[PDB]
C-alpha cells in the first residue's frame, strides 16, 4: 500500500483505489495503473522533474529502502492478475530488486524528489509507475 500527496491530489495504484478515491476522481489510466483523487487537506511531497535513472525505493515486505538502477519509462508486458488481463502497461520503469504484491504504492525517489510508485514485480524485477511527466500535479 501507499500514496503520493502533492497539493490537493493523492496518487495511488489504480488497482488499489478506494470508494472515496473514485468519488473524488481527478484522473485515471488503466494502462499506467494510476489514479489521482482530490483531497481537502494539502500534501507536501516534491515531484521530481528530471531524467534520473538511479534512486531509492521503499520495500514494505522487508521494511527497508533500496538503491536501484531503473530503465526509462516505457511499454512493458505485464502478466494477468485479478485486476487486469495480460497487457502492456505504459510509463513503466524496471529495476533488479525484491517486491511482493503488498509492496505496490511504495515510493521511488531520486535527489530531485518522488519519481513514481511500485506497481509490478516478479522474477526479481520490480516495476515502477512514473509520475514525473504529470506536470499538472504541481500547478
Ligand atoms: C508488484 C507486485 C508484485 N511483486 C511481485 C510479485 C507479484 C506482484 C503482483 C504484480 O506485479 N501485479 C499485481 C497487481 C497489479 C499489477 C499491475 N500493475 O498490473 C501487477
Ligand atoms: Zn531526479
Amino acid at each position: 500500500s501507499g500514496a503520493i500527496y502533492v497539493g490537493n491530489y493523492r496518487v495511488v495504484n489504480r488497482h488499489l483505489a478506494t470508494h472515496n478515491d473514485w468519488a473524488n476522481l481527478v484522473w485515471e489510466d488503466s494502462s499506467r495503473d494510476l489514479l489521482v483523487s482530490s483531497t481537502t487537506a494539502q500534501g507536501c511531497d516534491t515531484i521530481a522533474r528530471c531524467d534520473c535513472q538511479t534512486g531509492v525505493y521503499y520495500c514494505s515486505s522487508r521494511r527497508k529502502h533500496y538503491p536501484v538502477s531503473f530503465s526509462k519509462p516505457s511499454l512493458i508486458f505485464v502478466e494477468a492478475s485479478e485486476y487486469y488481463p495480460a497487457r502492456y502497461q505504459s510509463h513503466l520503469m524496471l529495476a533488479v530488486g525484491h517486491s511482493e504484491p503488498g509492496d505496490c504504492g511504495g515510493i521511488l525517489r531520486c535527489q530531485h524528489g518522488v519519481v513514481g510508485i511500485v506497481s509490478t514485480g516478479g522474477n526479481g524485477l520490480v516495476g515502477f509507475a512514473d509520475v514525473r511527466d504529470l506536470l499538472w500535479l504541481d500547478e
Side-chain angles (χ1 to χ4, degrees):
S1 56
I4 307 162
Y5 298 91
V6 48
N8 292 303
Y9 300 124
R10 164 176 140 91
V11 196
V12 277
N13 294 84
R14 195 197 186 271
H15 74 273
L16 295 185
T18 70
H19 296 237
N20 180 106
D21 282 322
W22 278 102
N24 294 284
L25 178 63
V26 180
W27 169 71
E28 59 78 26
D29 187 3
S30 323
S31 85
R32 293 180 66 153
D33 182 48
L34 281 188
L35 184 142
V36 174
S37 52
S38 56
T39 70
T40 46
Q42 181 129 318
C44 45
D45 277 323
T46 296
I47 310 303
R49 299 298 177 204
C50 71
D51 74 335
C52 281
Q53 272 182 265
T54 69
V56 179
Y57 82 99
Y58 180 68
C59 179
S60 62
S61 69
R62 293 286 178 269
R63 285 182 209 141
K64 270 174 181 80
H65 300 259
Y66 286 101
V68 285
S69 258
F70 50 88
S71 61
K72 288 190 167 172
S74 69
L75 259 185
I76 284 144
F77 184 92
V78 179
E79 285 300 320
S81 66
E82 48 177 292
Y83 304 102
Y84 303 99
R87 72 205 215 282
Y88 291 93
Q89 164 160 331
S90 60
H91 301 263
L92 194 71
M93 306 170 301
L94 294 197
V96 168
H98 169 73
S99 78
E100 281 164 37
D103 282 333
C104 288
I107 286 177
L108 170 69
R109 65 191 310 150
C110 63
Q111 76 189 113
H112 304 106
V114 177
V115 170
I117 54 170
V118 172
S119 188
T120 68
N123 295 324
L125 289 151
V126 49
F128 313 92
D130 189 52
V131 300
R132 300 176 286 181
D133 68 307
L134 308 178
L135 309 186
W136 52 269
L137 286 175
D138 297 313
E139 65 207 24

